[PDB]
Amino acid sequence: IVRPVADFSPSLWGDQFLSFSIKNQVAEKYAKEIEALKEQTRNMLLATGMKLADTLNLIDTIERLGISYHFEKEIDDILDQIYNQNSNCNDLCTSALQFRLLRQHGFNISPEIFSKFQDENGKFKESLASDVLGLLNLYEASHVRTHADDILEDALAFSTIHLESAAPHLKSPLREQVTHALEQCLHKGVPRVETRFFISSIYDKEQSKNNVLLRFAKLDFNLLQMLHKQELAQVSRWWKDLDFVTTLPYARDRVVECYFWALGVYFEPQYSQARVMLVKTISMISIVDDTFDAYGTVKELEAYTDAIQRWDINEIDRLPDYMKISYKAILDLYKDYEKELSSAGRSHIVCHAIERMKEVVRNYNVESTWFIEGYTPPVSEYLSNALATTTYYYLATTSYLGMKSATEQDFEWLSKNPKILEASVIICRVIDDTATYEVEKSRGQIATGIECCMRDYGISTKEAMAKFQNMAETAWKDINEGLLRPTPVSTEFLTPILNLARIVEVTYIHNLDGYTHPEKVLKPHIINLLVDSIKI
Ligand SMILES: [Mg+2]
Ligand SMILES: [Mg+2]
Numbered sequence: 001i002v003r004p005v006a007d008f009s010p011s012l013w014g015d016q017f018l019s020f021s022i023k024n025q026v027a028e029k030y031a032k033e034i035e036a037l038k039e040q041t042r043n044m045l046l047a048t049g050m051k052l053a054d055t056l057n058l059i060d061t062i063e064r065l066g067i068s069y070h071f072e073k074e075i076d077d078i079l080d081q082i083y084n085q086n087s088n089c090n091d092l093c094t095s096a097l098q099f100r101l102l103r104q105h106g107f108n109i110s111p112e113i114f115s116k117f118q119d120e121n122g123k124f125k126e127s128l129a130s131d132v133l134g135l136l137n138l139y140e141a142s143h144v145r146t147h148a149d150d151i152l153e154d155a156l157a158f159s160t161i162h163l164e165s166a167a168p169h170l171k172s173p174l175r176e177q178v179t180h181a182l183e184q185c186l187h188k189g190v191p192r193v194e195t196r197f198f199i200s201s202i203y204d205k206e207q208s209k210n211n212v213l214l215r216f217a218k219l220d221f222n223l224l225q226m227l228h229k230q231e232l233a234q235v236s237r238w239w240k241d242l243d244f245v246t247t248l249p250y251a252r253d254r255v256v257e258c259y260f261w262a263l264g265v266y267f268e269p270q271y272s273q274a275r276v277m278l279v280k281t282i283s284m285i286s287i288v289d290d291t292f293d294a295y296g297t298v299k300e301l302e303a304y305t306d307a308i309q310r311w312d313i314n315e316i317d318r319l320p321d322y323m324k325i326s327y328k329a330i331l332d333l334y335k336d337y338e339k340e341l342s343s344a345g346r347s348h349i350v351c352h353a354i355e356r357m358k359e360v361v362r363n364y365n366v367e368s369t370w371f372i373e374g375y376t377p378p379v380s381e382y383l384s385n386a387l388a389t390t391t392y393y394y395l396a397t398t399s400y401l402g403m404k405s406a407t408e409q410d411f412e413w414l415s416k417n418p419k420i421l422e423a424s425v426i427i428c429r430v431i432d433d434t435a436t437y438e439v440e441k442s443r444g445q446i447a448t449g450i451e452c453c454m455r456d457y458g459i460s461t462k463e464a465m466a467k468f469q470n471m472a473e474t475a476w477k478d479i480n481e482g483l484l485r486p487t488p489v490s491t492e493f494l495t496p497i498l499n500l501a502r503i504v505e506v507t508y509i510h511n512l513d514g515y516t517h518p519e520k521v522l523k524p525h526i527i528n529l530l531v532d533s534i535k536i
């Protein structure tokens with residue numbers, strides 16, 4: 001009877017993913033060759049009498065090529081040997097790479113390694129300003145700082161300014177790699193995205209590439225992409241048979257972008273079931289955010305919220321017709337989840353996701369009420385509600401549903417809101433509010449968290465946005481600290497939370513709503529990961 005209309009742009013993909021016939025002959029050919037190159041590479045790693053720097057370059061290259069998930073053991077064993085040896089008689093380049101690789105893998109190497117490259121003020125020696133490879137590796141390393149690493153405080157600023165100064169005169173592909181790093185650092189990037197770029201734009205054009213590794217990475221990428229395309233087809237069909245495109249026209253039609261999201265959380269083959277479960281959840285809760293924001297009268301959203309808490313088809317008759325559509329879809333979804341996990345006896349664990357979703361829906365209704373009433377809460381009260389509305393507690397919990405190694409102890413840990421999870425949630429919230437403002441406010445909004453922060457601290461819109469971006473930086477330090485050993489749960493269950501944070505940085509790069517406006521940002525990513533193969 002109202003009714004908003006956000007004039008949302010419609011899917012730009014149409015039919016093109018709906019049907020994918022895997023060429024089983026080609027798939028077997030790639031798998032055949034890859035097995036050979038895998039052992040060729042495993043033996044590269046197990047080689048002895050290698051220099052520290054050669055070893056680190058090898059691992060770095062393998063990781064960036066996106067084929068390191070084949071060698072978790074090997075790479076672990078090497079980094080552990082390096083961590084425990086205390087070698088540090090090296091140059092900036094090697095020291096910074098050593099720092100980053102060990103930190104990314106949970107090894108708490110001391111940042112004292114950088115002391116020889118600084119003066120008595122802890123500022124980096126400007127004499128290093130012409131070691132471009134050293135600057136490059138420091139830049140990268142500077143993004144894995146924790147709160148205990150204040151010695152690295154100058155690293156980003158210092159490395160950045162001299163990389164920018166150097167870049168135009170560098171040879172290719174190094175120039176392209178510097179320019180790219182300045183725009184998207186490795187640590188905070190989505191792995192498949194960074195890998196596609198590296199393989200195709202950098203390593204393939206290096207004078208000195210290892211041909212075995214190059215071939216390995218191209219084949220493995222193109223091969224996993226076939227699986228991804230199968231999943232998206234299967235998911236596109238699921239979505240199309242739901243026809244929310246017409247029966248729920250008010251919502252954003254973005255299931256492909258949702259798949260990209262799930263692919264960001266994990267790309268590995270063994271997580272196929274998990275990806276498919278996750279993306280269904282992502283796109284489904286996306287419908288709900290679109291009902292509480294626009295098209296949602298306070299009256300109507302109330303009954304829905306009560307229906308979700310009670311969680312029972314018997315309550316559909318209490319709902320407006322269009323809300324019935326969404327609500328049986330949700331309940332049906334969770335019974336699918338139950339039967340899909342029925343075989344593995346892991347059926348019971350579904351209720352962890354459900355309770356998180358109830359939590360999300362509850363806080364959606366608060367947010368709605370705040371707009372209609374026009375209530376601009378204190379920023380503290382605002383976050384105690386807005387954190388869950390990111391859906392990230394919920395997505396994190398969902399991402400475990402498909403992982404077969406996930407035990408109840410894992411869910412119990414996740415349920416207590418661990419610091420790594422909250423940091424990821426915080427990064428999503430503050431970056432969303434910076435980037436999707438004003439989108440929002442362009443639906444005449446006033447409930448926005450930015451406007452809270454302005455009214456609360458008596459500060460300008462630009463000022464508030466900074467202080468928010470700052471909260472994101474603090475939270476990255478807590479994510480990096482969350483990965484350090486001993487870890488509260490297996491690294492396997494930490495990486496999806498890290499990847500959730502990465503997806504935020506990537507989707508809202510340059511402060512734009514990449515999800516609502518996939519055009520500029522996400523479309524290229526989707527094309528490179530899901531449409532175009534790597535030319536062999
Ligand atoms: Mg919204
Ligand atoms: Mg919302």
Ligand SMILES: [Mg+2]
Nearest residue numbers: 432433436440
């Ligand atoms: Mg927003």
